[PDB]
From a paper:
Ciliary motility is regulated by the conserved nexin-dynein regulatory complex (N-DRC), which links adjacent doublet microtubules and regulates and coordinates the activity of outer doublet complexes. The N-DRC is a large 1.5-MDa, ~50-nm-long Y-shaped complex with two main regions: the base plate and linker regions. The N-DRC bridges neighboring DMTs and restricts sliding motions between DMTs. Here, using cryo-electron microscopy in conjunction with biochemical cross-linking and integrative modeling, we localize 12 DRC subunits in the N-DRC structure of Tetrahymena thermophila.
In this study, we revealed the molecular architecture of the N-DRC of T. thermophila by an integrative modeling approach. Importantly, our data identified an additional N-DRC component, DRC12. Loss of DRC3 in the drc3 mutant strain led to the loss of part of the distal domain (based on our study, the distal domain lost in the drc3 mutant represents DRC9/10 complex). We propose DRC3 binds to DRC4 first, leading to the assembly of DRC9/10 heterodimers. As a result, DRC4 plays a crucial role in assembling the N-DRC distal domain. Regulatory signals can be sent to dynein e through the N-terminus of DRC9. Therefore, the DRC9/10 coiled-coil may be the important regulatory hub in the N-DRC that regulates dyneins g and e by receiving the signal from CCDC96/113.
Numbering used by the authors:
A (entry chain R): 1 to 202
B (entry chain K): 387 to 434
C (entry chain P): 104 to 408
The structure:
C-alpha cells in the first residue's frame, strides 16, 4: 500500500509500421489519388481542353516538354506560373524521369491540378474572410451602442471557432502561432485584415 | 421524353467535349518527321 | 430495388453501434481492474475505413498502412478485424441489427488474441469501425498508446474553440501545441506553448485557450506534442514578445485528424439513450420494490404458524 507513486514515462514511439510494400506501389497509389483529385474539380471539358497546349510544343512527339514548352503551355491555358517555381517543379519532375528530357502530357495535368488546388484554396480563404466580416457586422448590429471602430476588430473569444467549417482542417493545436505572429499589442483584440495580409505572405 | 431529352443534352455537352478533344488532336504532329521510308506495297488482292 | 432494396446504414444507428461497442469494451476492462478505453478519433476513422473495406473484401494490411500514410499516423497502433456473415435464414431489421452487433462483440469477447489486445494494459486508447453489406458485417478496432488523452471538444462561443484533455503520462506535460500542414508538412501552420495552456499536475488535466478563424477546415490532422518535466513547463506565463518557444526540443505524440469530440449529435444521442435507460431502470426498480412489498405482505401471513 502507501500509494507508491509513481512518475513513469511511456515512450511514445513513432513506430507506425513504415510500409513493407515496394515503394513503386505506394507511388502509383499516390498518382492514382492525384488523378482522383484532378478529376474531382477538373471537368471533362477542361480535362479534354488542357491537352491543346502540350503536343505541338512537344515537337519530337515522344510525349515530353521542357521548361520553355511547359511555360508556353501554361500561358496558353490562361494561367501563369513563376519562373523559379516552374524551374523547381520541372527539376523535381525530372528527378524521377532520368531517361526523358521533358515532362509528359500528364505532367501538365498534374501541374494545373496543383495550381488550381492552391488557387481554389485561395478563393476559399477570401470567401471565408467575407463571411467572417459579415458575421462580425451582424453581431455588432446585435449591439446598437458599440463603436464602429471594432468593424474589422474582433475579440479573443470571437476568434477561435471558425476552423471546423470546410476545406482542409485546422485542428485545436493549429490555432496558436498566428496569434504570436500577429502579436496583439497587449490588448487581446485582433484584426482579420492583418490575417488577410499575413496568410498570403508565405 | 424528359429522360431522353436530358440524355441528349448530355449528348450535346459530350459532343462539345469531343470537339475540345479534337482541338487537342490537331496539336500533336507539328513537324515530325523521320521518314518511314522504304516499302509498304504488299496489299494482297483479297479485299473487302 | 424492387426485390432487394438498398440497405443504406443509419448514421445514427451506426453511431450508437460504435458507442455501445466502446462502452462494452469499457465494461470488459472494468471487469478486472482495467480502465475503460477512451475515444480516439483517428483510430475511429481508420477503423471505420477498414471496416467499410472489409465487408466485401478480406483482411488487408497494405490498405491499413496506406491509410496510415494518408493520415500521418503517430504512435504504435494495433489493429483488430472480424468479418462475420449473416445467417442464411435470419430475419434482418433494426432490432436484429443491434443484437447481431452485440453477438459480434461477444465473438470478439471469445478471441484470446482479441481479448488480450483490446484489453492489454500497454495501450490506453480504443477506436471502432463497423460496416456491413448484403451478406456480412465487418467489425474492426484500433488500439493506440498515447501520453495525452482527448476528453472533450466543443463549441463554446460563435468563434471560440474549447478542447479539454487529461494527461495520461505523469512525467510528460503538454508543453508544445503545434501542428504542420497535413497536405504540406513543411509549412508552419500554427502553434504555441504554455502561455495559453492550463495544466494541473495533480490531475494531469490540460485545457487549451487560443484564437482561430475560418480558413480551410476539413482535411488535415492534429499534431499533439509533449515534453519532459511539466514542472519545468511555465504554464500560463505571459512570455515577452521577443521570445519564441523552441519546439524542436519538443517531442510529437499524436497526429490526429480534427473532428467534433464529441460531436453534438453523438453526445446528444448518447444522452438520450442513457436517460431513457435510467427512466426504464427506475420503472424496473419500482417493479421489484412493489414485488418485495407484496411478497413480505404474504410472508407476514405465512408467519402465523
Amino acid at each position: 500500500m502507501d500509494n507508491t507513486g509513481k512518475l513513469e514515462k511511456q515512450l511514445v514511439t513513432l513506430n507506425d509500421g513504415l510500409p513493407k510494400k515496394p515503394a513503386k506501389e505506394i507511388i502509383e497509389e499516390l498518382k492514382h489519388h492525384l488523378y482522383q483529385d484532378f478529376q474531382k474539380f477538373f471537368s471533362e471539358e477542361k480535362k479534354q481542353q488542357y491537352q491543346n497546349n502540350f503536343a505541338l510544343f512537344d515537337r519530337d512527339n515522344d510525349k515530353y516538354i521542357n521548361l520553355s514548352e511547359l511555360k508556353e503551355l501554361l500561358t496558353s491555358v490562361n494561367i501563369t506560373f513563376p519562373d523559379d517555381e516552374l524551374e523547381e517543379l520541372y527539376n523535381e519532375f525530372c528527378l524521377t524521369s532520368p531517361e526523358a528530357d521533358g515532362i509528359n502530357e500528364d505532367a501538365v495535368f498534374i501541374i494545373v491540378s496543383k495550381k488550381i488546388r492552391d488557387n481554389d484554396k485561395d478563393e476559399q480563404l477570401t470567401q471565408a474572410f467575407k463571411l467572417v466580416e459579415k458575421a462580425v457586422n451582424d453581431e455588432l448590429a446585435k449591439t446598437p451602442n458599440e463603436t464602429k471602430e471594432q468593424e474589422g476588430y474582433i475579440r479573443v473569444e470571437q476568434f477561435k471557432e471558425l476552423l471546423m467549417t470546410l476545406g482542409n482542417r485546422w485542428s485545436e493545436e493549429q490555432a496558436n502561432e498566428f496569434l504570436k505572429d500577429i502579436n496583439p499589442k497587449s490588448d487581446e483584440r485582433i484584426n482579420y485584415l492583418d490575417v488577410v495580409k499575413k496568410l498570403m505572405k508565405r | 421524353e424528359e429522360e431522353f431529352r436530358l440524355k441528349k443534352e448530355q449528348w450535346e455537352i459530350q459532343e462539345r467535349r469531343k470537339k475540345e478533344a479534337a482541338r487537342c488532336i490537331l496539336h500533336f504532329l507539328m513537324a515530325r518527321k523521320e521518314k518511314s521510308k522504304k516499302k509498304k506495297k504488299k496489299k494482297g488482292k483479297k479485299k473487302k | 430495388s424492387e426485390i432487394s432494396g438498398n440497405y443504406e446504414a443509419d448514421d445514427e444507428t451506426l453511431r450508437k453501434i460504435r458507442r455501445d461497442l466502446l462502452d462494452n469494451i469499457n465494461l470488459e476492462r472494468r471487469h478486472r481492474d482495467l480502465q475503460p478505453v477512451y475515444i480516439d478519433l483517428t483510430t475511429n476513422n481508420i477503423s471505420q475505413y477498414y471496416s467499410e473495406y472489409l465487408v466485401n473484401n478480406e483482411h488487408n494490411q497494405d490498405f491499413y498502412e496506406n491509410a496510415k500514410v494518408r493520415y500521418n499516423n503517430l504512435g504504435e497502433c494495433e489493429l483488430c478485424h472480424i468479418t462475420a456473415k449473416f445467417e442464411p435464414d435470419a430475419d434482418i431489421t433494426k432490432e436484429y441489427i443491434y443484437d447481431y452487433f452485440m453477438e459480434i462483440g461477444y465473438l470478439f469477447l471469445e478471441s484470446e488474441e482479441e481479448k488480450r489486445i483490446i484489453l492489454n494494459p500497454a495501450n490506453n486508447h480504443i477506436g471502432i469501425g463497423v460496416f456491413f453489406d448484403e451478406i456480412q458485417i465487418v467489425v474492426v478496432l484500433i488500439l493506440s498508446e498515447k501520453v495525452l488523452c482527448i476528453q472533450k471538444i466543443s463549441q463554446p462561443e460563435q468563434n471560440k474553440i474549447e478542447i479539454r484533455g487529461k494527461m495520461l503520462d505523469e512525467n510528460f506535460g503538454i508543453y508544445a501545441i503545434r501542428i504542420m500542414n497535413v497536405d504540406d508538412q513543411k509549412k508552419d501552420i500554427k502553434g504555441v506553448g504554455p502561455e495559453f495552456i492550463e495544466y494541473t499536475r495533480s490531475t494531469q488535466e490540460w485545457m487549451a485557450s487560443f484564437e482561430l478563424e475560418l480558413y480551410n477546415q476539413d482535411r488535415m490532422a492534429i499534431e499533439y506534442y509533449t515534453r519532459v518535466s511539466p514542472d519545468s513547463i511555465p504554464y500560463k506565463k505571459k512570455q515577452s514578445k521577443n521570445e519564441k518557444l523552441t519546439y524542436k526540443h519538443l517531442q510529437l505524440r499524436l497526429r490526429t485528424p480534427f473532428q467534433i469530440y464529441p460531436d453534438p449529435k453523438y453526445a446528444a444521442e448518447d444522452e438520450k439513450e442513457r436517460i431513457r435507460k435510467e427512466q426504464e431502470i427506475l420503472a424496473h426498480e419500482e417493479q421489484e420494490r412493489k414485488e418485495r412489498e407484496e411478497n413480505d405482505a404474504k410472508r407476514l401471513k405465512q408467519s402465523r404458524k
